[PDB]
From a paper:
Here, we describe identification of two bacterial effectors that reverse PR ubiquitination and are thus named deubiquitinases for PR ubiquitination (DUPs; [name] and [name]). Structural analyses revealed that [name] and SidE ubiquitin ligases harbor a highly homologous catalytic phosphodiesterase (PDE) domain. However, unlike SidE ubiquitin ligases, [name] displays increased affinity to PR-ubiquitinated substrates, which allows [name] to cleave PR ubiquitin from substrates.
To reveal the atomic basis underlying the bias of [name] toward deubiquitinase activity, we sought to determine the structure of enzymatically inactive [name] ([name]) in complex with a PR-ubiquitinated substrate. A Rtn4 peptide, acting as a minimal ubiquitination substrate of SdeA (Kalayil et al., 2018), was modified to harbor only one target serine residue. Accordingly, [name] displayed a strong binding affinity and high kon to Ub, ADPR-Ub, and PR-ubiquitinated peptides, while the SdeA PDE domain showed weak affinity to Ub and ADPR-Ub. More importantly, the same mutant was now able to promote stable PR ubiquitination.
Numbering used by the authors:
A (entry chain B): 1 to 76
B (entry chain A): 3 to 310
Amino acid sequence: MQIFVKTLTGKTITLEVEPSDTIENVKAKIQDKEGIPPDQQRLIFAGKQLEDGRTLSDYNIQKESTLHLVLRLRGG
Amino acid sequence: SILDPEVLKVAEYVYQERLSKPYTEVGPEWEYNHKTPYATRATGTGHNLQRFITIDDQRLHRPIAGLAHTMRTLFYSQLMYEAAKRQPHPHRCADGRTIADLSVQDLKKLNIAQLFFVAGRESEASYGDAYHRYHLYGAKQFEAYARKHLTHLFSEKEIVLYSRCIEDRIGDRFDETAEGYLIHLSHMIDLMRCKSPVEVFIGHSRGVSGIVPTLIQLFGREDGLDIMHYARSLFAATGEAVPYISSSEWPHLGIESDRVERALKIVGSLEVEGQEADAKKTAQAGFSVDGCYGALVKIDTPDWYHQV
């Protein structure tokens, strides 16, 4: 499915994912597309933070869902 | 918008001993996996998150819990002091005082305490066990320094007091004291730099209001949104990525439209664009107290703010 990844400033991408896809898996995907290292990404959905072991289906994340990325500095 | 030189001298020592120093609870031994929860020294996520960034091949350690975050809260506690005084009936804490009752001396003591609030971090780890351990370290770092150099300013009752605030004990109220209330409310504003609009405007549960609703409920919509725009100007001044705001997007963030409409009746409409992080401003803020302080004093406080 598609899910939206927005920085707090508002720069947005989509990803093609599957609901049982770990956040570590999706952080690896966000690096493949954008060059942002996993541990420079703090991910948030429905006002909770997202965890590396858990799945999208453990947060109820469905098609065209917006997650929120906290990025301090591009290239930092 | 002016801080006592004895406050900045305490922030000089803190930056050298704690905020400059790397994150030491990190690496493989502090990784976490729920599935194997006690296969590591970590009992929860977050130990390896944003440990440093690189500006001109220089490390900016604990960037999100660093010098710019720590010193921005002092300006917020100095603004809310006047904001509280404008209220007929400011919130009255468990000790029986309001922030408005605080004198100019207590605020200088409260500013010195705010410096060690997150200074005891060893990582971005956020689970209560890491959070309460790190707050305990910052508290003991305060106690030692305060007992040794600041007896001319603090009484032994006040070190006990301010250490208890920084600790944020399990079984102490939010506003248990008018100093700790304000220290929390200062810490809180600055969360705007790392939180989704939900936790900022909707609140992260049905109970909890949301950061800006808190500023509006306590200080009024006018004073309450002045305080928010100033927090976001101070983000800009310290090279932080200023978030955008959009009341049109709140319905599509996976919440029940009760808590959106509640936030919409309270916040009102807010549309306002975000601004992108600057390596140069961030580094100026992050690597010296002089550069942090200088970058932040330049920024206009609202029209009603007149320091005593």
